[PDB]
Design a protein around this ligand. Structure first.
Ligand SMILES: Nc1ccn([C@@H]2O[C@H](COP(=O)(O)OP(=O)(O)OP(=O)(O)O)[C@@H](O)[C@H]2O)c(=O)n1
Length: 364
């Protein structure tokens, strides 16, 4: 599609960055990013045209978003911020993000590796292009680790020292907060997110990020324990799933104050029930686990756990004692139902009698 228009336009168009990586590693992505030696916006406009699909150009920035099918496309004009592709690439973060694939019909299919992105790709390694890089875009500090987390990669040695420097230089602080919180967000959407936390703690990045936070053993314990819990509840109920990353985020801010914590979650654009989970854990959780343990009958447990959110329950499973309790609630007590004739006999106040029959049959 693009290669042919680039012929008609006599341009050169390339697939660039993570997408390429995702391809070499065989991930599927319908979000595809290009860099153009030529006018990108018009290439986009003609692609859209011939497909007859709506396209949004961005004249100021010089890019265009357009969506072919459920597949998404963003065309960007090459820039050094003319510019050779190698210039567009050399400004990027990591070797494995620095590659490109030709849609140009002559070299079509070609992986373009200047900095050894493929070499470094097989070697399972996070390597920046140049050493100033961290200073250039400090958010990368996380992304690096993030990559290393998701794909199980090691930092380049030089990269390692570079990163510890940058961290230590508190660049992590002086970077605009918005991009950082953005990153942390995208980090906690990860399946490998725990390993990312391993790297976080390793470089102590979080201490340069959130106000008043530091790491303690118990936190880590309950974090791993959380991974077990999430593994399990994800296994049993496939329809009951939530985005679990938040939990771990929460587990970090637990020892923190409620003021700075809720400020931080609102800062994290945490969903309502998330910040609500923060509030309920900060305030009434002690009484919660107490009266949960103070409940002798299965139905009392039922009446205690009903109004509350699921994530909160998942958080309540961390205590060894309450494990079998939550197991009973989730697998049994909440599964019990009722016939007709009896209801009609209670009808001859109703919900009273129903709650009563609940209390009666549930205890065993
Ligand atoms: N802080 C950043 C953000 C991104 N990039 C560059 O931006 C491109 C893609 O942006 P991004 O989507 O953030 O990185 P991806 O590798 O595509 O990973 P993902 O799709 O998950 O975001 C890559 O070439 C990368 O080099 C960068 O150099 N520094």
């Amino acid at each position: 599609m693009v290669g042919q228009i680039a012929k008609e336009m006599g341009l050169r168009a390339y697939i660039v960055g993570g997408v390429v990586r995702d391809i070499l590693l065989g991930k599927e992505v319908w979000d595809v990013d290009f860099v153009v030696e030529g006018n990108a916006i018009e290439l986009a406009k003609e692609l859209a045209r011939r497909h007859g699909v709506n396209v949004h150009p961005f004249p100021e920035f010089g890019t265009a978003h357009l969506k072919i099918g459920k597949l998404k496309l963003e065309f960007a004009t090459a820039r050094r911020e003319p510019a050779s592709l190698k210039e567009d690439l050399i400004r990027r973060d990591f070797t494995i993000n620095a590659m490109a694939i030709s849609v140009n019909l002559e070299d079509y299919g070609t992986l373009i590796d200047y900095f050894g992105g493929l070499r470094d790709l097989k070697d399972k390694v996070i390597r920046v292009l140049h050493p100033v890089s961290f200073i250039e875009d400090p958010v990368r500090i996380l992304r690096a680790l993030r990559f290393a987390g998701r794909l199980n990669f090691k930092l380049s040695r030089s990269t390692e020292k570079l990163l510890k420097q940058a961290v230590n230089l508190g660049l992590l602080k002086e970077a605009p907060r918005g991009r950082l919180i953005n990153e942390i967000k995208l980090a906690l959407r990860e399946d490998r997110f725990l390993e990312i936390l391993e790297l976080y703690r390793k470089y102590r990045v979080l201490e340069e990020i959130i106000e008043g936070f530091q790491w303690n053993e118990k936190v880590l314990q309950k974090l791993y324990a959380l991974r077990k819990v999430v593994d399990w509840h994800a296994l049993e109920f496939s329809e009951e799933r939530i985005d679990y990353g938040w939990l771990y985020l929460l587990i970090l801010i637990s020892n923190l104050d409620y003021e700075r914590g809720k400020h931080f979650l609102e800062e994290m654009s945490a969903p309502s029930w998330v910040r609500e989970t923060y509030k309920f854990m900060k305030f009434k959780l002690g009484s919660l686990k107490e009266e949960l343990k103070k409940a002798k009958e299965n139905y009392e447990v039922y009446r205690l756990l009903k109004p509350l959110h699921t994530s909160v329950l998942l958080l309540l499973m961390l205590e060894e004692e309450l494990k079998e309790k939550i197991k009973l609630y989730l697998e049994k007590l909440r599964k019990v139902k009722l016939p007709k004739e009896k209801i009609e006999e209670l009808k001859k106040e109703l919900g009273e009698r129903i709650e009563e029959l609940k209390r009666e049959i549930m205890n065993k």
